[PDB]
Amino acid sequence: VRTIKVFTTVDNINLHTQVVDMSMTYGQQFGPTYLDGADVTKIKPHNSHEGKTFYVLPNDDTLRVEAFEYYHTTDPSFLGRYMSALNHTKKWKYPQVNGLTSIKWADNNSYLATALLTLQQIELKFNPPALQDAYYRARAGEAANFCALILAYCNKTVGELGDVRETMSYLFQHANLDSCKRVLNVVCKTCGQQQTTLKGVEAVMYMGTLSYEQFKKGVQIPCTCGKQATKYLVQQESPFVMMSAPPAQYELKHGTFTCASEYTGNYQCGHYKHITSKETLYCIDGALLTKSSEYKGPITDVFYKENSYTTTI
Ligand SMILES: Cc1ccc(N)cc1C(=O)N[C@H](C)c1cccc2ccccc12
Ligand SMILES: [Cl-]
Ligand SMILES: [Cl-]
Ligand SMILES: [Cl-]
Ligand SMILES: [Cl-]
Ligand SMILES: [Zn+2]
Ligand SMILES: [Zn+2]
Ligand SMILES: [Zn+2]
Ligand SMILES: [Zn+2]
């Protein structure tokens, strides 16, 4: 019998020693098996495999429990989707641009770069250790794993056209936003005044206007009586808010927002860039950087800082 020793894992933290038969595929012995994202199920062991760490699909209770604690999912497809993504994201370049980890353009990744740059500028704790560990590593310049996880958690494959607002929404659902509270007042002539409290993701996201200021002064929304009504912000408790609208020409003023998603072209198949407010306005287009003191352009998301706001209306 001819054997090498390897380590199997689902989380790359708990490692299990296996002795593999060199005449048999990884798949015959472990089920689905991956090396740095590369599917090696149907491959047999090379000598240069000796001692290396392979990911396996969980096939005992111990591994299912370790996978849930690391990823916060029991979805049996999750590992395979993560590894197929990583197989591309490990070949992408992650240049530092204006002190932020960006992504050189590849495989329709503009939305993932914009998301990655945004996440480095807002306060967020991820619930799954997999995402928190990879977020820290991405901050420090090694973002391949984090980008692969974003793809797996959003149910997206490499090359697929992605929306930043939807991606941030999915990531926020995997984050601790329980302390986040939003109180709204809706004012209609007929039904009158009704207050609503939102928590978590719905407390930090709004779709309809880019202007946090305009949200405060109220916006015109339909009432279920038939009338238009005024929705306005009463109380906000969150470290940030995210204001989105369909792309439209918008002026961005230095020092009045944290960062913003620029979107150019048709529905779905256009291109994202990222605008960030520093000592001046920086436009990060993957690996490319431009700066200007003023900006007018097609914006769809704006991020703002917050701690505690109460209206005076
Ligand atoms: C990039 C992408 C991937 C997947 C999906 N489903 C949507 C988008 C997308 O186009 N989003 C932008 C920001 C967008 C959003 C809302 C309304 C829009 C109307 C016209 C043009 C763009 C619009
Ligand atoms: Cl493990
Ligand atoms: Cl969970
Ligand atoms: Cl690639
Ligand atoms: Cl979670
Ligand atoms: Zn174990
Ligand atoms: Zn969870
Ligand atoms: Zn690729
Ligand atoms: Zn009414």
Numbering used by the authors: 2 to 314
Give the published text:
Nevertheless, PLpro is a multifunctional protein having an essential role in processing of viral polyproteins, maturation, and assembly of the RTC, and it also may act on the host cell proteins by disrupting host viral response machinery to facilitate viral proliferation and replication. Briefly, the protein has two distinct domains: the small N-terminal ubiquitin-like (Ubl) domain and the “thumb–palm–fingers” catalytic domain. The palm subdomain is comprised of six β-strands with the catalytic residues Cys111, His272, and Asp286 located at the interface between the thumb and palm subdomains.
Given that compound 1/GRL0617 is known to inhibit SARS-CoV PLpro with an IC50 value of 0.6 μM33, we expected it would likely inhibit the SARS-CoV-2 enzyme and indeed it does so, with an IC50 value of 2.3 μM in our assay conditions. The structures of complexes with inhibitors 1, 2, and 3 were determined at 1.95–2.30 Å, including compound 3 in both wild-type and mutant forms. Considerable conformational adjustments are observed for the side chains of residues involved in ligand binding. These inhibitors bind to protease S4/S3 sites. The S4 site is where specificity of the LXGG sequence recognition motif is determined as it recognizes leucine side chain by fitting it into hydrophobic pocket. This site is only partly conserved between SARS-CoV and MERS-CoV enzymes explaining lack of cross reactivity of compound 1 reported previously. The inhibitory effect of compounds 1, 2, 3, and 4 can be easily rationalized as they anchor to the site. Although somewhat away from the catalytic triad, their binding still interferes with the recognition of peptide motif LXGG.
